[PDB]
């Protein structure tokens, strides 16, 4: 009877909605026993297999469904989602366009296509496709929330207040109905959701990993309870997809090699293949052991490998970011598993024991925002490799084109040696700053910049145009190598005014909200000649920011955009700003370290989420408490004072310049020692038979 197979298939759909994936698979398969040529059952089964990580088996059943029913649009759209997850973007696009060709009113396919455009950098086409989806299916949480993020990306704030209301309403409805929220955990920090909602979002994304490991039917691992097998050494494993040219390596690449080999054995588990960069070379060479898990795609086999190495503390550096394989942590191959550095938020998941943070970033009164127990570093949990990667920025000189410290700037390893040959340099007390007068050499340098030349040679020294680093040494531009030449950086290179205050922010534009730009407008209005220096990320967001700024009373010429630059130029050109204005909604994290290493004071207002408090943690470690605001008024007053009291600005800039060296902020050796003390507190606690508890010392 036809109702037999149909009933099994439709009941399975219900079980699937309820989260009973295993029962759904069973019913789908029974439906296929009763009715082998059941296209819908093939495609629905493939959908749950995809959810279980059985991607090749899913594809096989999608193809069967389409063999049975060549115009089965659902199967083409579902197959696209699976190909997308396999990184086959062209295959996904061909499936989605076939589905929409079959059924132009197919809302899900329009939304899935939009997700390709969104990920490809084609935000205008993504917005158009999501809007078609919502036109066809007005109640469509995935499409609405991903549309909302598109609009965030380009700073389209049309009806922003109503958008936030609906986002929170959608999440509340999904959490109440026990569904996976359509807001991604990494994005939840950007919206006015409660801490409970954000933690619940994270928990439910973490639960996705359980569906993928449960099918492995692996038992619990037996964990080490002493250091005898490791000759007294604590075995720490760092798991990351970002051992390579990625911000995470730019922060911690030095740490594996700085661990004390007498007390620690360091295992680095790469989730990504070797991208050929010096970052990957360094970690592979300096870690005690380096394991390329990209060659072991099965999470059961990969976890077995971790467990066979005897790891005591396994460190999750991805959280819910691209490249993560949190299934590895869900299997618990190690007795102690901690979040660290790579993800600014909680996992919400039972299989992570600790989050490594600090008292400034995550004060004990907000521990309820995290599912993990707090493990405090003594100063900040943040760290950066700037002292190793960009030592050419330790010193600088300027040209007195009339004295400014940030209009025409030279940096270089051989900069002092070069200045020795110049018998007329002036040393200015503010370490101190050499000033090249407007002489023959200075005119040649300025001519190089004005004429757009790549580099010149003076007294045998190479002097490089800071805009041309990729043409001179691509490895220097990326931070893989220290630049060898003397580099020239000027405000004229970026269209900045010579005679006015520059406030900068080099964050992704989605970290800006209307409230933040209103605050920045308030600051500019109080500093007559000041400008705001922002990043084209993406460029299509520029006219929106300009529109809203002019709407708030700021002429268009008050906001200056620059393109994304290579890593080294991005850090180096921070020297041209007077002050960095941090984003309160979600602080700069890497970019906060970058701006401080350039010596530029950063003004911040810490919020309540971990992501909104990182910059104040960095400034506390640096030792500049006067740059941390308690409310918007103080934030504006600090920025305006820096921009109007030029003697105070000189004092503050001098403080950052000096304390970036003397403070712990960039001291990777000290960081590793304190990190090691924290690991031992974790281990001694576990070794004594205790479950995880707050390591707040």
């Amino acid at each position: 009877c036809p109702t037999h197979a149909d009933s099994l298939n439709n009941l399975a759909n219900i079980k699937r909605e309820q989260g009973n994936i295993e029962e759904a698979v069973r019913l789908y398969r029974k439906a296929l026993e009763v009715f082998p040529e059941f296209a819908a059952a093939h495609s629905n089964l493939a959908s749950v297999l995809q959810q279980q990580g059985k991607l090749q088996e899913a594809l096989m059943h999608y193809k069967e469904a389409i063999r049975i029913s060549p115009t089965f649009a659902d199967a083409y759209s579902n197959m696209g989602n699976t190909l997308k997850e396999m990184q086959d973007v062209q295959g996904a696009l061909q499936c989605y366009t076939r589905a929409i060709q079959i059924n132009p009113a197919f809302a899900d396919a329009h939304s899935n296509l939009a997700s390709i455009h969104k990920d490809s950098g084609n935000i205008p086409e993504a917005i158009a496709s999501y809007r078609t989806a919502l036109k066809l299916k007005p109640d469509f949480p995935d499409a609405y929330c991903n549309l909302a993020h598109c609009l965030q990306i380009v700073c389209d704030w049309t009806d922003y207040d109503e958008r936030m209301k609906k986002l929170v309403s959608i999440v509340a409805d999904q959490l109440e109905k026990n569904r996976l929220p359509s807001v991604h955990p990494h994005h939840s920090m950007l919206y006015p959701l409660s801490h409970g909602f954000r933690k619940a979002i994270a928990e439910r994304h973490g639960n996705l990993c359980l569906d993928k490991i449960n099918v492995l039917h692996k038992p619990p691992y037996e964990h080490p309870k002493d250091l005898k097998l490791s000759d007294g050494r604590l075995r720490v494993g760092y798991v990351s997809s970002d051992f390579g040219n990625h911000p995470t390596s730019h922060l911690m690449q030095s740490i594996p090699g700085m661990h004390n080999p007498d007390k620690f054995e360091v295992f680095c588990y790469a989730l990504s293949p070797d991208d050929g960069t010096n970052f990957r070379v360094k970690v592979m060479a300096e870690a005690n052991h380096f394991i390329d898990l990209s060659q072991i795609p099965c999470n059961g086999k990969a976890a077995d490998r971790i467990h066979q190495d005897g790891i005591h503390i396994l460190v999750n550096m991805n959280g819910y970011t691209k490249g993560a394989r949190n299934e590895l942590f869900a299997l618990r191959p190690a007795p102690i598993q901690a979040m660290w550095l790579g993800y600014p938020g909680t996992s919400g998941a039972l299989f992570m024991d600790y989050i490594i943070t600090d008292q400034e970033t995550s004060p004990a009164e907000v521990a309820e925002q995290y599912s993990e127990k707090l493990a405090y570093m003594p100063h900040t949990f943040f760290i950066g490799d700037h002292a190793n990667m960009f030592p050419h920025l330790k010193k600088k000189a300027v040209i007195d084109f009339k004295i400014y410290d940030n209009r025409i700037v030279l940096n270089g390893i051989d900069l002092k040696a070069f200045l020795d040959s110049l018998p007329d340099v002036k040393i200015v007390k503010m370490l101190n700053m050499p000033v090249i007068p407007m002489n023959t050499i200075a005119e040649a340098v300025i001519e190089m910049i004005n004429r757009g030349q790549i580099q010149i040679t003076i007294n045998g020294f190479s002097i490089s145009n800071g805009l041309a680093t990729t043409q001179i040494n691509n490895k220097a531009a990326t931070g893989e190598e220290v630049p060898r030449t003397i580099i020239v950086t000027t405000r004229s290179q970026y269209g900045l005014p010579e005679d006015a205050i520059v406030y900068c922010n080099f964050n992704q534009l989605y970290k800006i909200d209307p409230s933040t730009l209103q605050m920045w407008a308030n600051i500019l209005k109080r500093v007559p000649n000041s400008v705001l220096w922002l990043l084209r990320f993406p460029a299509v967001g520029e006219p929106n920011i300009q529109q809203y700024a002019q709407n708030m009373g700021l002429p268009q010429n008050r906001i200056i955009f620059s393109p994304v630059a290579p890593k080294e130029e991005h850090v180096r050109r921070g020297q041209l700003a007077d002050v960095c204005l941090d984003t309160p909604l979600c602080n700069g994290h890497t970019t906060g370290m970058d701006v401080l290493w350039a010596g530029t004071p950063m003004v911040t207002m810490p919020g309540e989420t971990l992501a909104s408090r990182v910059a104040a943690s960095q400034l506390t470690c640096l030792g500049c408490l006067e740059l941390i605001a308690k409310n918007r008024q103080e934030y504006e007053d600090i920025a305006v004072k820096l921009g109007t009291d030029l003697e105070y600005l000189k004092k503050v800039r001098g403080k950052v310049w000096k304390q970036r060296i003397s403070s712990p902020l960039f001291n990777t050796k000290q960081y590793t020692m304190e990190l090691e003390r924290l690991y031992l507190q974790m281990w001694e606690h576990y070794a004594a038979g205790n479950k995880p508890d707050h390591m707040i010392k």
Binding site: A5, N112, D119, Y320
Partner: peptide, 13 residues
């Protein structure tokens, strides 16, 4: 990261 997608569940009729 990769934007999530929406699977379509087909009802048998």
């Amino acid at each position: 990261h990769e934007t999530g997608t929406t699977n379509t569940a087909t009802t048998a009729t």
